[PDB]
Amino acid sequence: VINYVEKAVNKLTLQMPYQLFIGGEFVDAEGSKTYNTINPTDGSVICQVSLAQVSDVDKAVAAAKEAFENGLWGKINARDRGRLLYRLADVMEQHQEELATIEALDAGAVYTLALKTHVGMSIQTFRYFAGWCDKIQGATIPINQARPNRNLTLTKKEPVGVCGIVIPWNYPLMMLSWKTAACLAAGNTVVIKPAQVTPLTALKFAELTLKAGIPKGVVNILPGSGSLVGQRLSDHPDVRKIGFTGSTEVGKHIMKSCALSNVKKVSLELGGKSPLIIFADCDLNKAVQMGMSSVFFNKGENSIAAGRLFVEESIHNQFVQKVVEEVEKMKIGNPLERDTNHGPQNHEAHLRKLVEYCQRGVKEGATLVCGGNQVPRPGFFFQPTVFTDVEDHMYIAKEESFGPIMIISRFADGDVDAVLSRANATEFGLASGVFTRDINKALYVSDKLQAGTVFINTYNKTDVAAPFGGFKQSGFGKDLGEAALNEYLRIKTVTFEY
Amino acid sequence: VINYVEKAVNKLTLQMPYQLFIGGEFVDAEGSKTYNTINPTDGSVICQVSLAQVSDVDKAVAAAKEAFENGLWGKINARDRGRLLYRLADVMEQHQEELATIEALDAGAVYTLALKTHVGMSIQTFRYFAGWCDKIQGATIPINQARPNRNLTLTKKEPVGVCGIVIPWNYPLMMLSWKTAACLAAGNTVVIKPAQVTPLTALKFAELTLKAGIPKGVVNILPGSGSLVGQRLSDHPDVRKIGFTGSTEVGKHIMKSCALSNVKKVSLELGGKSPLIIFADCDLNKAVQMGMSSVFFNKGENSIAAGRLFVEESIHNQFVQKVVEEVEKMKIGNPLERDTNHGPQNHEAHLRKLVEYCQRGVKEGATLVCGGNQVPRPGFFFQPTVFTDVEDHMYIAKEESFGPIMIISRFADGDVDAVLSRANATEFGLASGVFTRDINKALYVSDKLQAGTVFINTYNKTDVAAPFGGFKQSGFGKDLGEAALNEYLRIKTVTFEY
Amino acid sequence: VINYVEKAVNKLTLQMPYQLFIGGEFVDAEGSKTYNTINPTDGSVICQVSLAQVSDVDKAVAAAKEAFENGLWGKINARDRGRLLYRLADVMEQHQEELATIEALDAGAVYTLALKTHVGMSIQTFRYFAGWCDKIQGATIPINQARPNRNLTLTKKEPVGVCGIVIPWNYPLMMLSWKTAACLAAGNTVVIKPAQVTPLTALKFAELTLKAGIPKGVVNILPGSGSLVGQRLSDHPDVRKIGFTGSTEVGKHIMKSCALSNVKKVSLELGGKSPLIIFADCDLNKAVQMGMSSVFFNKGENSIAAGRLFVEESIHNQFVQKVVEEVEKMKIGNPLERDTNHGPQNHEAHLRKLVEYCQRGVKEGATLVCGGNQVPRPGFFFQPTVFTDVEDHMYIAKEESFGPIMIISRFADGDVDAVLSRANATEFGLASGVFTRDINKALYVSDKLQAGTVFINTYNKTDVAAPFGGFKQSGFGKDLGEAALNEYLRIKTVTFEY
Amino acid sequence: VINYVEKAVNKLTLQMPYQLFIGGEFVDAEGSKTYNTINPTDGSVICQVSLAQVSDVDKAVAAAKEAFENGLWGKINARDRGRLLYRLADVMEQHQEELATIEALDAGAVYTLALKTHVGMSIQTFRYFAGWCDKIQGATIPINQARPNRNLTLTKKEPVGVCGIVIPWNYPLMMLSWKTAACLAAGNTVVIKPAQVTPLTALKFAELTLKAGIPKGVVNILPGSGSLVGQRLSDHPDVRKIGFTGSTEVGKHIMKSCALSNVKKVSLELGGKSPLIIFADCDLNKAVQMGMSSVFFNKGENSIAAGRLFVEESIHNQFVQKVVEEVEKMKIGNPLERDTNHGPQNHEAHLRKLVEYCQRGVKEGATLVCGGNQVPRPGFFFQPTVFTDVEDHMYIAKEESFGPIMIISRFADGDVDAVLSRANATEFGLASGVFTRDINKALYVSDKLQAGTVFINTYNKTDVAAPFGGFKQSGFGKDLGEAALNEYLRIKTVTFEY
Ligand SMILES: NC(=O)c1ccc[n+]([C@@H]2O[C@H](COP(=O)([O-])OP(=O)(O)OC[C@H]3O[C@@H](n4cnc5c(N)ncnc54)[C@H](OP(=O)(O)O)[C@@H]3O)[C@@H](O)[C@H]2O)c1
């Protein structure tokens, strides 16, 4: 019998676990410590949640180790592991309205979007990776033969073993799912640390693993702080791999911690300052629509968001006029209301950071065309913002906002290489985009952009089958696609002589 | 016009460059600083070698950056990149005797072995990877369609950019070749730091890249210390990937340095304590030959060396008798002499370390059945060594000797899981082996061994097509095989809407 | 409303469609023609089934064409096609007892086996290939660049289009499923011709595609004769690919008909005379069990059945003795009786062939140890048969029986190459096996056997992920595995200059 | 010593073998039968060439079989097989001027073009496939486990064995090289039948295999007729695969012959009627240059030649004007003159077919804008020809000319599906192209074209790494690229229980 925080909202009765999930059971943290999770629509406390301690991490890791080494997960057919993950996906789909509602409460995710993305994509992620289980294959290799004898060389793909997954707050369930689906399809067991400010969909997901029949200890979830819980995961002698999504600065620290303990494997999905180049020969109205999506999607809490838009001189003013027209039509409001287009930012500290960000933008001399401020209403809403006359030396040209702030520079008519160079002049390299009807420009620009993803005449078009990851200080390794599997597998080479 | 140290030896004339190699030219280090490289056959000084300084590292990195960004290497077809690397392999082949002689002098490599392995496998490496250049391929992916529009998603495999390669001294030319061939085949440029005590074949190799037509700046070589030169490579903001082979402790430090600067990619080939399990049902005579080889190959200076032999009780004593019989037959002496089959250890410090290692084995109660001492002759020769009665708790059961020291334990007849468990009780996981005529035991044991390579009825059987790399604290990433390319490539996802 | 033949049997009420399945509905053939399907347990008529005519083939092909070119199947995401196929597997699972019972009635499949294999593997097949839909990927290739311009080359994996599948009667549903699953997963539409003698599970499967939501016209099923319906499929100008399983001589004719019409693609899964080589050093009791299975599985109605057993002289007589003891324990009976382990042969004409086969065996000088005859009881049962003293020149050493007939020869102790040569002296090359505890012998024999599948210390171990197909006159192309998809895809190369 | 036809021409003394090449020897045909090969520049007899008889085919096949089964080729490492093929490419490169001259004489290949394409791409093909030999890899597959036991399933990629290669006359050396390089790289041995009219580079190539150290019998070359020699190859019981390139009608007969004998594998590269669609928004002067190349390249003797050009209404007349202007500038003449743009047609009967083809185009109502007749001069020259007002029902709109004949239709501005439908209304499907600056048109058109290759803003851009093959009646299977290997390898599945 599981304890729940019951809540009647959105024409449903929510049943929300709030405890640590260790070894297949929900339990209090050491000393029954708890913390509050805050609803960004009104600032209220949703409920209290267990606050994991070092000793709780050790319990979770030991559970994950036991489940891997002796438990059923390490013994079943790859095909049957997939069946379990495809059942987990079905269970998530049967509970999708509920999960989207929890996500709306916990993270401020507009409910209609959370059904399609926060939850919908999480469901696709498990189904997609479930199909990979019995299709992960090694090789047989035509090695030189030790004549007069013979040789056979094969490789085996094996799990890495116990993994730690540490994620941010922008899409709590989806970031969990991206990494967990891959981790599990490869046959690993896991300890997951959601962002402290957003534990709820992770904990409801935990309960769903029980309904799906995922063996005890395969999935362990520890709400709590990075510096305590996350840190211990990265130092742990029995953890063999860390999957991390977050800031560059925490990413550096995680990699260092992987190094100093046991050279556990690490992959890093870090920040972005993604450029979007819009040429005069694009479809203008479409550029306005995708341009807006590139910045404002999920209230800008989107690591691949276009962090700079470069717009060709001859269409720049008209582009800005049209963006403003469209911005005025966005309906800011409660994420649970069906007419809402723009929900609140995820938490208070981040709202304050966006306010400071835009003050500094104005100070340094950029033109504030609209927004820039907290919306006058309860909770942590921020007004969709547009800046123009942004010059390359400005702080807002360099720094990741992670909010709904469109940052626009001009480039001269016909000036392709010059704008590319401005677009690449950053230590980030997560995403990028180009709008043009011209095939030669589109191909050339996409060769030249120094980013892990290039969108052409679209934006935010990720997919569970398309690998996603950065270059430079945006990190390394992929989430999604076949390529994601390689972060969660080891290759054993076996060489016979006969 | 290049400066050489010239030496008539082994029926040829060695012409050995001795300077740093930067931007296609041989140049003195900052301040014309130099150091001595020492011949382990007689302890003599071979010659003076330039000692790279921080500013030399910066020059080398800048030459590599320019070669990659604006030089010809970043412009030619992948096919033509292949041609250049196939030509470099040819040029190495034309100088095979000279290279192997330099290696005998510099590392004490027995000449006949250096020809086949140190040099022969290096030539194979470049030819293998040259063949990969126009066969490195991305994907097209059946992503969900934004109906009524269409989407196309492809990936492009691109180079990482400037890489640094840091390598040890046991196989100077071969370690360099393993990593450099994969690095260059993937379209990168590189700065290489040979182990300070073994710079000579790296510099000769550098000259050979000129003969081959490799554009200036693509290969740069900096003889110098790990703590100055290697450190700066791992710290440099323009270096994007480090390929490292060496000890676990230095590996941790390299990985930490990569994190703290610019989250440059890293791969790590670290130490081993590889177990070899010998069953009573094996071909015993052949087990003695392969068992001796698993320890003594290349005077034990070999990361995959069997650092522990577990011999089934009923054949143990007979196995020992025969090894002792064969050890007595080994000709220890000058690596250039054709009857030599055991050359000197690589350098004085390491010989000392081996004497100390064997003292500790004796002190702790292991039975020294032969060897254990420096051979009383000039240079740094150490006796082929056999320990028996080795207990799991003993130092020599756990620490990597990196020398010709056979370390033998018994296990009970019919035990399989118990010996596996003892063989797995290490934080190393580089290689391993099993001798048995029994198919079921062979397949089962290779499943259970926690190591990146498992040899069955052979040992030391690496191959340029077979991926090579560790689990646990032996590191991560592969050298050799298709898999090695992945350390040297980035994946860019390109998604169109149309 | 669908018309059914209703039947109360096996504690179920069977609802069996009996008409042509065309464009998503059950319809009568041209002129309402029908034929009888016969129950092999007692020779009775199960029911009347529509008898497809030429005009019915054309209607089916037209419905497949329309569903491919204009219907929903041609438009949905690969991922959603996957979902439809997974759902189809679920529906099959919900009907598994009914499908196994229908197969028991129609093909004489022993019910408990049909549940596990005939039906159970069919379900696995659809789930497996459902997983492939969104993981079928093309390439991007590093072609030479037309400088100063650039080139991009990619490949797209596309459906072949309208396919015909023609299958035999030994595993009616499973042979349908193997090929149909791969065909549909690749995005094609299909016209299926079951063996005329075994139409029933195919017709039920057709109804299940409706339950699962497969768009109309994607699956069309045509009970009828090979010489009429099969022939027209292979001749049809709008069919682009034939997938065929059956005899070598019909295979040859199908291939010829593909040629003479529109060079439609073809794959051919033909007969087998598969050798099983049993060495003295094998586990003898397991060799008996697996040897039993290799011949008698599914009443020998199994294309990969061992059609010759080669037993090493020193264990030959002992092996035969043990086999006879085991054969005597087999319960022959009605496939619905839970204690039955040997059911009747599929249909009468095949029983007749088996009788003639053994007459000729005895005529030519082989020693008939047991069986060889129809069991005296109603239906078409055949007594499990063992021949010894079989010589290489004998008809029964050459020709496929496709019935429960063990055909044993000796080979001299210590021989390997001689027995290999005898095992390879056949124009067949479908499967093969070796039992030995010796690793070197097992690897060597598996190299030298000229067969598409080699079993080692097991037999009949097929798997939906393991490719299955023949060499030489056993055909070409694979069913099962990733490799099966290649028969049902085309590759388009797209090369840009920009 | 080998007998040569000796000829002082093009600054060289050509030494041309003229006999059959069987088992590493140049030998006369049965009864010393010969025929004449004709120089198409002046109609003169170059020399007499042996005319292979059936018994000669049988000797070639026996030599290939023996080379495969017991000779060195079947025993050497894959890597060493690669070396021999690289060395063969080196030898071809050292004889490249000589080979190009021979091709100029035998096929009318313009010398400068022959250096770059006929010969140059042949050299690239051998180098490319040489790199594949040690990178052909099988798989290890995570099959369901027969609990309590374990299973290992692996695949081995194996050669098919003795192959027959039958080719046409348009690029005699290159067609040979495309197929043979892939054939040999996969480890097979081969009998090659060159087009009767063009034996000479094939025979010179044979001698080059000797110089390169390709083991006797691996390559056998039999000049002679398709209906005698080609027939017997396709009928032969020891040939296991035919690789065919030629007409659709012969392809059908070849496929039939493979069926009727021993179901040998077959791949088919058949004809083309390839559409090129040129939109008004293309770069027009470039479209004229590439449009001309698309038809006139290699005097139109090019399977992928654009057999119809669809030109958008608003640019049609200007396009035709420019074409005519550029056509008038083409230098027609002796393929040895360095300024020749247009050589003679390959042989007399083909010239006559081209004269008839143009008669018929005028007769049925097409507008002859220029050319259409034999150039009056010695040899077999045909005028570069342009037709306009071509309509979809016309003979010249459906039939492959295989000559320098531009066949132009208009299509209405702003229709796309309508032009596609016209471009797809053929049973051919070898190649196609689209010229447009619009990315959306380019991508959509490339999806919709029913052709194995789509060129975008280029034409004739084949590459040794890019797979090349038809859909529909243009055949199946690929030459070039990784995908070519699959026609020449078999897959053996090996499954263990342990
Ligand atoms: N897995 C494999 O493929 C493999 C192969 C060969 C060897 N090994 C391992 O190598 C070890 C023995 O070699 P070793 O004792 O020379 O190893 P090491 O001390 O770790 O040195 C390896 C290389 O790293 C350099 N280095 C030292 N400090 C550095 C720093 N702070 N930053 C960057 N580079 C630095 C060294 O420079 P210096 O020359 O100045 O010392 C040397 O070039 C054994 O454990 C052996 O198993 C592993």
Rounded Cα distance, A316 and A308, in Å: 14
Q: Which residues in C137-248 belong to E strands, given as ranges? A: 138-141, 151-159, 162-166, 189-193, 219-221, 241-245
The closest alpha carbon to D450, from D425, D468, D475, belongs to D425
Rounded Cα distance, D379 and D388, in Å: 28
Phi, then psi, of B238 in degrees rounded to 5: -100, -5
The helix (run of H) or strand (run of E) holding residue B90 is helix B78-94
Structure tokens at B148: 């009524």
Residue A366 is given by DSSP the state: -
Rounded Cα distance, C487 and C479, in Å: 9
Does C439 touch chain B if contact means CB atoms closer than 8 Å? yes
Q: Which residues pair with B358 in a beta bridge?
A: none
- Which amino acid, B435? F
Q: Which residues pair with B406 in a beta bridge?
A: B386
Rounded Cα distance, D497 and D267, in Å: 36
Residues in chain D: 498
The helix (run of H) or strand (run of E) holding residue A179 is helix A172-185
Residue of B nearest to D464 (CA): B134
Residue C269 is given by DSSP the state: E
CB atoms within 10 A of CB B169: 19
Q: What is the edge-to-edge ordering of all strands in the sheet holding D162-166?
A: D25-27, D20-22, D219-221, D189-193, D162-166, D241-245, D265-269, D475-476
Centre of ligand 1 to C-alpha B180, Å, is 16
> Which residues 6+ apart lie within 8 Å of B428 measured at CB?
B248, B270, B271, B272, B273, B274, B307, B400, B470, B472, B473, B474
The helix (run of H) or strand (run of E) holding residue B12 is strand B12-16
The helix (run of H) or strand (run of E) holding residue C308 is strand C306-312
Helix axes C172-185, C78-94, angle to 10 degrees: 160
The closest alpha carbon to D61, from D239, D293, D269, belongs to D239
Pocket of ligand 1 (CB under 6 A): B 166-170, 175, 193, 195-196, 225-227, 230-231, 234, 245-247, 250, 253-254, 269-272, 303, 400, 402, 430, 470
Test B439 with D498 for CB contact under 8 angstroms.
Answer: yes
The helix (run of H) or strand (run of E) holding residue C104 is helix C96-107
Rounded Cα distance, C276 and C431, in Å: 9
Rounded Cα distance, C290 and C292, in Å: 5
Rounded Cα distance, B498 and C350, in Å: 57
Structure tokens at B364: 């702790």
Rounded Cα distance, C134 and A466, in Å: 10
DSSP 3-state assignment of B23? coil
The closest alpha carbon to C92, from C216, C214, C247, C197, belongs to C214
Structure tokens at A135: 């299709």
Structure tokens at C320: 């035969």
Pairing state of beta strands A162-166 and A241-245?
parallel
The closest alpha carbon to C243, from C184, C304, C302, C170, belongs to C184
The helix (run of H) or strand (run of E) holding residue D367 is strand D367-370
> D446 near C124, Cβ under 8 Å?
no
Rounded Cα distance, C35 and C51, in Å: 6
> C454 near C444, Cβ under 8 Å?
no
Structure tokens at A390: 């942004």
Test B443 with D496 for CB contact under 8 angstroms.
Answer: yes
Rounded to the nearest angstrom, the gap between the alpha carbon of residue A239 and the centroid of all alpha carbons in its chain is 22
Residue B374 is given by DSSP the state: B
Structure tokens at B136: 């490195």
User: Chains meeting C at 3+ CB pairs closer than 8 A?
Assistant: A, B, D
Q: To the nearest 10°, the Cα dihedral for A353, A358, A361, A362?
A: -140
Centre of ligand 1 to C-alpha C218, Å, is 62
Instruction: Find the distance separating the first CA and the last CA of chain D, reported in whole Å.
Output: 58
Q: Which atom of ligand 1 sits closest to the CA of residue B468?
A: 3
Structure tokens at A192: 């997951």
- Which amino acid, C25? E
* Count of alpha carbons within 13 angstroms of residue B343, beta-carbon side: 30
Q: Which residues pair with B5 in a beta bridge?
A: B16
Rounded Cα distance, D107 and D169, in Å: 7
The helix (run of H) or strand (run of E) holding residue B58 is helix B54-69
How many helices, marked H, and strands, marked E, lie in chain B? 15, 22
Test D263 with C142 for CB contact under 8 angstroms.
Answer: no
The closest alpha carbon to B279, from B136, B140, B437, belongs to B437
Residues in chain B with CB shorter than 8 Å from the CB of D150 are: 443-444, 447
Rounded Cα distance, D96 and B100, in Å: 36
**Sign of the CA dihedral with D459 first, then D462, D465, and D466 last:** positive
Residues in chain B with CB shorter than 8 Å from the CB of A471 are: 490, 492
Structure tokens at D266: 């077959």
Structure tokens at C324: 């006879």
Phi, then psi, of B341 in degrees rounded to 5: -125, 0
Rounded Cα distance, C3 and D484, in Å: 50
**Sign of the CA dihedral with C64 first, then C70, C76, and C77 last:** positive
Q: How big is the C-D interface in CB pairs under 8 Å? A: 174
Per-residue burial over D341-358, b = 16 or more CB atoms within 10 Å of its CB, e = otherwise:
bbbbbbbeebbeebeebb
State the residue for tokens 């306005």: A288
Query: Which one of D124, D134, D137 has the shortest CB-CB distance to B128?
Result: D134
Pairing state of beta strands D20-22 and C219-221?
unpaired
Q: Which of B125, B166, B480 has most ligand 1 atoms within 8 Å of CB, for mutation?
A: B166
Does A482 touch chain C if contact means CB atoms closer than 8 Å? yes
Cα B89 to Cα A461, B119, B126, B194: the distances in Å are: 44, 10, 5, 19
> A380 near A361, Cβ under 8 Å?
no
Cα B231 to Cα B51, B203, B227, B255, B261: the distances in Å are: 15, 20, 5, 11, 11
State the residue for tokens 């990315």: D439
Centre of ligand 1 to C-alpha B167, Å, is 6
Give the CA angle between residues A280, A281, A283 to the nearest 5°. Answer: 100
Query: Which one of C427, C455, C494 has the shortest CB-CB distance to D495?
Result: C455
**Sign of the CA dihedral with D489 first, then D492, D493, and D496 last:** negative
Per-residue burial over A266-282, b = 16 or more CB atoms within 10 Å of its CB, e = otherwise:
bbbbbbbbbbbbbbbbb
Domain boundaries, chain A: 6-271+464-498, 272-463
What stretches of D133-283 show up as alpha helix (H) in DSSP?
172-185, 200-211, 231-235, 248-262
Query: CATH fold of A272-463, please?
Result: Aldehyde Dehydrogenase; Chain A, domain 2 (3.40.309)
Does D128 touch chain B if contact means CB atoms closer than 8 Å? yes
Rounded Cα distance, C294 and C296, in Å: 6
Rounded Cα distance, C293 and C286, in Å: 10
Centre of ligand 1 to C-alpha A467, Å, is 34
Residue of B nearest to C187 (CA): B142
Query: Which one of D440, D447, D498 has the shortest CB-CB distance to B444?
Result: D498
Rounded Cα distance, A245 and A267, in Å: 8
Pairing state of beta strands C274-278 and C45-50?
unpaired
Is the CATH number 3.40.605.10 carried by domain C6-271+464-498? yes
Structure tokens at D459: 């034409």
> C126 near C85, Cβ under 8 Å?
yes
Pairing state of beta strands A20-22 and A25-27?
antiparallel
Sequence-separated contacts (24+) of C420-425 with Cβ below 8 Å: C420/C277, C420/C445, C420/C448, C420/C449, C422/C275, C422/C310, C422/C392, C423/C275, C423/C277, C423/C308, C423/C310, C423/C449, C424/C275, C424/C448, C424/C449, C424/C450, C425/C392
Rounded Cα distance, C324 and C313, in Å: 17
**Sign of the CA dihedral with D435 first, then D436, D437, and D440 last:** negative
Rounded Cα distance, A196 and C49, in Å: 66
Structure tokens at B24: 């296609």
**Sign of the CA dihedral with C238 first, then C243, C244, and C248 last:** positive
> C403 near C299, Cβ under 8 Å?
yes
What stretches of B236-336 show up as alpha helix (H) in DSSP?
248-262, 284-296, 313-327
Q: Which residues pair with A492 in a beta bridge?
A: A156
> A444 near A291, Cβ under 8 Å?
no
State the residue for tokens 């969660």: A488
Rounded Cα distance, B218 and B207, in Å: 13
What stretches of C199-247 show up as alpha helix (H) in DSSP?
200-212, 231-235
Residues in chain D with CB shorter than 8 Å from the CB of B86 are: 86
Test C443 with A137 for CB contact under 8 angstroms.
Answer: no
DSSP D139-167: EEE-PPP-TTS-EEEEEEEEE--EEEEE-
Rounded Cα distance, A402 and A274, in Å: 11
Structure tokens at C407: 């055909």
Residues in chain B: 498
Cα D170 to Cα A9, B359, D463: the distances in Å are: 76, 78, 18
The closest alpha carbon to B29, from B197, B228, B227, B187, belongs to B228
Centre of ligand 1 to C-alpha D365, Å, is 81
Q: Which residues in D219-331 belong to E strands, given as ranges? A: 219-221, 241-245, 265-269, 274-278, 306-312
Rounded Cα distance, A408 and A287, in Å: 13
Question: Structure solved using which method?
Answer: X-ray
Q: To the nearest 10°, the Cα dihedral for B273, B275, B276, B277?
A: 160
